[PDB]
């Protein structure tokens, strides 16, 4: 019987730029609440599982521990900043003003939503006045009234700005917090986004199962010195078998012999 099962995978290089969440220092432009496409990179979610220091991270359609198994064409990272009273109401299948009247999410929207404390860093003692609301849709220059002013003072004609009452003094339930949605899309495209695939320590000259980048087999390995360039997989001098296999870290060429 084979002794133990073995998997060997290459070192991780492409880290998702989630660091724009840990080290975000500034707010986005008014037109551009942060909606970014994420592709051609490996998404490391392992830190989020055991971080446990942030307000919420609840996410639906996929079990948390199987993210590395699934592969998606695209990831949309949509980040806003909203107040606390709506944090439990930002969820697929629920109601609300912003989620319904600005951009639609499907009732069974599968994706992963996190809410972040900004109490001691981004909150302002005098109040940050950067928060606006879009309130109305009737059907599928912007004036709050119905009649156009045409540059003439009168009814439904207003002043550019009056001081607005935004204050931090409100209670704990009422501070604003940051919201980020990571949406996974699986569509008709070559698989480019893959989760990190962890490997183990290597043991030689024992009857073992081996799994090299998905290549599964069983046997015991011996070193072969035949001339293969590192990028070479297929060749026809023996024409019969997947002769040799190459570790990603160590470029050594190993052939297999079956056990009893």
């Amino acid at each position: 019987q084979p002794t133990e099962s073995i998997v060997r995978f290459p070192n991780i290089t492409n880290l998702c730029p989630f660091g724009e969440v840990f080290n975000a220092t500034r707010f986005a432009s008014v037109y551009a609440w942060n909606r970014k496409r994420i592709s051609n990179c490996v998404a490391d979610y392992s830190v989020l599982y055991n971080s446990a220091s942030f307000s919420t991270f609840k996410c639906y359609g996929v079990s948390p521990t199987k993210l590395n198994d699934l592969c998606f064409t695209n990831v949309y990272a949509d980040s806003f900043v909203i107040r606390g009273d709506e944090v439990r109401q930002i969820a697929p299948g629920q109601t609300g003003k912003i989620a319904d009247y600005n951009y639609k999410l499907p009732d069974d929207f599968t994706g992963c939503v996190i809410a972040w404390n900004s109490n001691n860093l981004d909150s302002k003692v005098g109040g940050n006045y950067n928060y606006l609301y879009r309130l109305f849709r009737k059907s599928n220059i912007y004036q709050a009234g119905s009649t156009p002013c045409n540059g003439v003072e009168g009814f439904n004609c207003y002043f550019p700005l009056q001081s607005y009452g935004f204050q931090p003094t409100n209670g704990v339930g009422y501070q604003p917090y940051r919201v980020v949605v990571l949406s996974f899309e699986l569509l008709h495209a070559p698989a480019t986004v893959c989760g990190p695939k962890k490997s183990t320590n290597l043991v030689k000259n024992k009857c073992v199962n081996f799994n090299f980048n998905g290549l599964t087999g069983t046997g015991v390995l011996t070193e072969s010195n035949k001339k293969f360039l590192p990028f070479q997989q297929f060749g026809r001098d023996i024409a019969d078998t997947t002769d040799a296999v190459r570790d990603p870290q160590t470029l050594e060429i190993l052939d297999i012999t079956p056990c009893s």
Partner: nanobody
Amino acid sequence: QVQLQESGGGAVQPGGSLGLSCTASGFNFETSTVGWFRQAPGKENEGVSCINKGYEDTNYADSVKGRFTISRDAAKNTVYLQMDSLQPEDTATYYCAAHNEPYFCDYSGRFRWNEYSYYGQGTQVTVS
């Protein structure tokens, strides 16, 4: 925009009655909810009454249940609140308010202070 005018406040003696009136303009509040909120010194802003004229469905705060009656006049386009057996806790400045989304049914009126988008000047009622 929407403009609100409250009137009818004053001084009352406990056991009496008072009549508040809310006049709305800039929007047709005949198929939408309009309500009365209060704020008192040392007390949080609390909604006390609301009426939806679409079927005139009524709601009152638990603190005011069984004591106040709210009605809506289409001909006057106003909201009239009648207060019977007033108590000292009813002494407050009253605001007339409405929901951003106009409702079209028997919806009970929300009495959370966050419920107002446009707000009037308010009228004082002192039960003393």
